[PDB]
């Protein structure tokens, strides 16, 4: 069965955290989870353009934007 694919997110990088510049003409599901002991799962259907501040840990965080392949990111020690 065919399913659509949304726009790829734009990532702005800051200290131990990411901010996804998101655009979606339709409500789509965004699901994030950490790679550590605590998952800290967040999920919200997003309509329009909204930027979300997501704090990432050293162990990592995996975010799923729409029906795309999940992408894993990891925080550095840039204090």
């Amino acid at each position: 069965c065919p399913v659509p694919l949304a726009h790829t997110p734009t990532v702005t990088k800051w200290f131990k955290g990411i901010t996804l510049h998101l655009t979606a003409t339709r409500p789509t599901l965004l699901t994030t989870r950490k790679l550590g002991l605590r998952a800290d799962a967040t999920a919200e259907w997003i309509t329009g353009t909204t930027s979300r501040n997501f704090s990432v840990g050293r162990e990592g965080l995996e975010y799923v934007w729409g029906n795309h392949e999940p992408v894993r990111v990891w925080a550095q020690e840039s204090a």
């Binding site: 800051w14 200290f15 990592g60 992408v71 990111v73 990891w74 550095q76 840039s78």
Partner: peptide
């Protein structure tokens, strides 16, 4: 300290205690 903040490659190593 690194200029980059988030890299798309995991940490291969772990920091030790007070090291």
């Amino acid at each position: 300290p690194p200029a980059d903040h988030i890299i798309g490659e995991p940490h291969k190593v772990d920091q030790e205690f007070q090291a």
